[PDB]
């Protein structure tokens, strides 16, 4: 009766139907039964990487024992699970723990051959004394039976350190299942999730949840890396079955917020955005009613909705409103970069490719180098495409490869080999892509790097992964890699495509997509630039409202002088701060150009006065 | 003489007998030595230059285990700036390395092979 | 002087908790002053960080006032290493004076060196 206070009982909990079907893994159940009935040295250990299902093997063994498909020498063994945490509780005297353990071993020994102890996480059995060593004569007589499961590394951290204990055990290596066997499992666990949450589940949902968790979520092994998607889609549908959906709630809370703010200010402005939002919320509401007048189960879109809401990556199915964006993207990106039609037509062809799901799975969604002369826009394009995807300029990861001039700088983006000074810090590129893997990665001035960094950007391409000084293959599988350059500027296409093959190797140019050589500028397509600068200046002094009434001959005059065929559009942005900014900054801190007032500009025969 | 005869099978046959070691031969090939910047690979670089940790191509395999037979494959294409290095090998029992230490050749065997001939008697 | 004899597995922890409850149990009076606070991070090494982050939930509401003074190059070695705490503190930079203010400082300390040395 000593086991009644300290242990538990799986078998009484197995007869009452508290467990899930464990259909799968017949080989390992047969292996455990093959070991457990041996004469001596008959105590197996289930060893596997964490996630693969090791307690469920023992639950399936218990269900098979209660069912009665076991061999002859397993007639009602009544598996009893122990607790090593309950043993050390109040045992604060000189001998209380060892006499408790001796009472437990006596109540195991006086039985004939029945009780099969199940000790989960038996790295705890190593210490627990300050003792804990009076198990070796009980183990090395074939008297204790002791099924117990650990993980992989916790085995070698404790038990391989203890090479005398290690002999009196077996090892049953449990490995990960496949994707098809995951699908075969997920048709069995469906009834419990339909009982606990009152929903319905299509088989298409269970095959899409097993296909779609292979690509995106890559940290956990897959009997249970795909259970959570179903288990959270059911909860989201249970949210939407109760009182109200989601959007209408979103909009109601938002308009209540803007209402609050506005009435507190009593800004206009918001007054408009209120009204607009009230129009929308009205429309939707009516639509809601209409629908009612006219979802109730999970589908293969809801799983992708969960894997899009988690881990950042938008991976739904041809979403609404974005077709008004991606088919407008080739023209919306032109409002910030003027000219270069071929480069934008090639960049859009990598976002509209992978949004529709045509691109290759184990490959980055775009990784391509573009170059030319200076002042053209090759940095402005990368900062201009990542503005509408991300709503901020700082979601870019912009590392500069001008500083990596020598050999050993490569270790700053991979970490340290384990055993050296900076190991707590880890990497400096890799530890920022493992968090939310959807960024845009830049590489500025790839001319300047030592030719050993190209041995790191070589398995990034065509595979997508890299290890580091921590032992974790991060995935670059759906980021966008942008390389810049400045080679040559001395021909149309022949000299720069000779210099690229002169500097780079053939095995690196092979791994790229379309290399995009730019063209420069033209004076007709320069004037269209200039107003942006003026409009940008019209934003910069917006906090004092000194908006500029610029005459059109001034915009004409800024285009004649300032055109250089070799320095791009960069002399113009210094010419503006020489013409306007000097005289305005002199007139602004002396009085007389007080805020809330407007100033025009007129073309003097050499300058332009205020 | 010819190739494929025993011309290096004789060489392995006297290392394992007279030096009692199976792997105590050094087969270097002078099939790259046509220039002035190629001879310095078989002696080393000064302390501060390109090939220094690897040492000499010849001497750092003779400093340890100085009980070796040494071959020299295909001498006939070598530039005439090896034979002054190779001459004092067979004229004195000393040579200087890239570091500045001393190697002693007084208990080795040199074998200079080629393949021209074999049609003339 | 608070880690004097604490070789048992729970003495320093309850000692610091008793000090914090003695400060909290006085209704907003005591200004604490911990000099050279760059050695407060790894105060109690429990083999597992469980000391030096006991005041970490208490500073966020601001119940103890905690004047400190650390060196500039001792600050990016211990606190910036362990940057969860670095937001809890405002920084007050102190630069050295010039010659003309040192002339004014030295004329006020010519009252304590005439007493210790009767000159």
């Amino acid at each position: 009766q000593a086991l009644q206070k300290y242990s538990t009982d799986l078998t009484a909990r197995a007869r009452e139907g508290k467990l899930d079907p464990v259909i799968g893994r017949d080989n390992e159940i047969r292996r455990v039964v093959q070991v457990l009935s041996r004469r001596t040295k008959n105590n197996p250990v289930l060893i596997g990487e964490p996630g693969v299902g090791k307690t469920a093997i023992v639950e399936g063994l218990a269900q098979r024992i209660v069912a009665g498909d076991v061999p002859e020498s397993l007639r009602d063994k009544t598996i009893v699970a122990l607790d090593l945490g309950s043993m050390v509780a109040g045992s604060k005297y000189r001998g209380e723990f060892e006499e408790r353990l001796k009472a437990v071993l006596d109540d195991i020994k006086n039985s004939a051959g029945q009780i099969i102890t199940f000790i989960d996480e038996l790295h705890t059995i190593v210490g627990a004394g300050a003792a804990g060593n009076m198990i070796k004569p009980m183990l090395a007589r074939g008297e204790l039976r002791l099924v117990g499961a650990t993980t992989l590394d916790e085995y070698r951290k404790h038990i391989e350190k203890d090479a005398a204990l290690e002999r009196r055990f077996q090892q049953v290596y449990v490995g990960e299942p496949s994707v098809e066997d995951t699908i075969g499992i997920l048709r069995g666990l469906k009834d419990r999730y339909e009982v606990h949450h009152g929903v319905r589940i299509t088989d298409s949902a269970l095959v899409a949840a097993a296909t779609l968790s292979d690509r995106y979520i890559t940290a956990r092994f897959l009997p249970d890396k795909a259970i959570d998607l179903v288990d959270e889609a059911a909860s989201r549908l249970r949210m939407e079955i109760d009182s109200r959906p989601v959007e209408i709630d979103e909009v109601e809370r938002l308009v209540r917020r803007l209402e609050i703010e506005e009435m507190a200010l009593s800004l206009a402005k918001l007054r408009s955005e209120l009204a607009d939002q009230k129009e929308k919320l009205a429309e939707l509401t009516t639509r809601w009613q209409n629908e009612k007048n006219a979802k109730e189960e999970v589908g293969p879109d809801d799983i992708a909705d969960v894997v899009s809401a988690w881990t950042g990556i938008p991976a739904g199915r041809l979403l609404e409103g974005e077709t008004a964006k991606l088919l407008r993207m080739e023209d919306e990106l032109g409002k910030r970069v003027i000219g270069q039609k071929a480069a934008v037509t090639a960049v859009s062809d990598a976002v509209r490719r992978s949004r529709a799901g045509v691109s290759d799975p184990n490959r980055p969604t775009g990784a391509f180098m573009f170059l030319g002369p200076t002042g053209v826009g090759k940095t402005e394009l990368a900062k201009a495409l990542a503005d509408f995807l991300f709503d901020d300029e700082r979601a870019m990861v912009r590392i500069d490869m001008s500083e990596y001039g020598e050999k050993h700088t490569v270790a700053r983006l991979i970490g340290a080999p384990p055993g050296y000074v900076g190991y707590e810090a880890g990497g400096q590129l890799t530890e920022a892509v493992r968090r939310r893997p959807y960024t845009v990665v830049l590489f500025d001035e790839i001319e300047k790097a030592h030719p050993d960094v190209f041995d790191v950007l070589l398995q990034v391409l065509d595979e997508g992964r890299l290890t580091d000084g921590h032992g974790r293959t991060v995935d670059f599988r759906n980021t966008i890699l942008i390389l810049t350059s400045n080679l040559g500027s001395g021909g149309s296409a022949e000299q720069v495509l000779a210099a690229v093959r002169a500097t780079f190797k053939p095995e690196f140019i092979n791994r790229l997509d379309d290399v995009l050589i730019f063209e420069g500028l033209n004076p007709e397509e320069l004037v269209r630039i200039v107003d942006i600068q003026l409009a940008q200046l019209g934003k910069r002094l917006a906090q004092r409202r000194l908006q500029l009434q610029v005459s059109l001959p001034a915009k004409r005059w800024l285009a004649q002088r300032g055109f250089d065929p070799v320095y791009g559009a960069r002399p113009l942005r210094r010419l503006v701060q020489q013409a306007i900014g000097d005289q305005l900054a002199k007139m602004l801190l002396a009085g007389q150009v007080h805020d809330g007032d407007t100033v025009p500009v007129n073309v003097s025969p050499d300058a332009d006065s205020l | 003489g010819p190739t494929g005869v025993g011309k290096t099978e004789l060489a392995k046959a006297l290392a394992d007998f007279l030096f009692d070691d199976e792997r105590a031969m050094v087969r270097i090939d002078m099939s790259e030595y046509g220039e002035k910047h190629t001879v310095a690979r078989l002696i080393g670089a000064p302390p501060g230059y390109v090939g220094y940790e690897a040492g000499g191509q010849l001497t750092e395999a003779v400093r340890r285990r100085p009980y070796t037979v040494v071959l020299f494959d295909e001498i006939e294409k070598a530039h005439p700036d090896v034979f002054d290095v190779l001459l004092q090998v067979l004229d004195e029992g000393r040579l200087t390395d890239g570091h500045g230490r001393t190697v002693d050749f007084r208990n080795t065997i040199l074998i200079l092979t080629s393949n021209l001939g074999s049609g003339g008697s | 002087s608070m880690v004097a004899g604490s070789k048992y597995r729970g003495e320093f922890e309850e000692r610091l908790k008793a000090v914090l409850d003695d400060i909290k149990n006085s209704a907003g009076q005591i200004i604490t002053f911990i000099d050279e606070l760059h050695t407060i991070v790894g105060a109690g090494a429990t083999g597992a960080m469980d000391a030096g982050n006991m005041i970490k939930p208490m500073l966020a509401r601001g119940e103890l006032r905690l004047v400190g003074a650390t060196t500039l190059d001792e600050y990016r070695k211990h606190i910036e290493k362990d940057a969860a705490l670095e937001r809890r503190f405002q920084q007050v930079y102190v630069g050295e004076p010039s010659v003309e203010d040192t002339i004014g400082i030295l004329r006020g300390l010519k009252d304590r060196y005439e007493v210790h040395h009767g000159v």
Binding site: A130 | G48 | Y8, G47
Partner: peptide, 26 residues
């Protein structure tokens, strides 16, 4: 009558560092 009163400990493990030894390339 006698209690045990388990105690704590402190473990140290330092870290090596390497020098890079540039080569004058001639």
């Amino acid at each position: 009558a006698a209690a045990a009163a388990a105690a704590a400990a402190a473990a140290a493990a330092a870290a090596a560092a390497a020098a890079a030894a540039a080569a004058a390339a001639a």
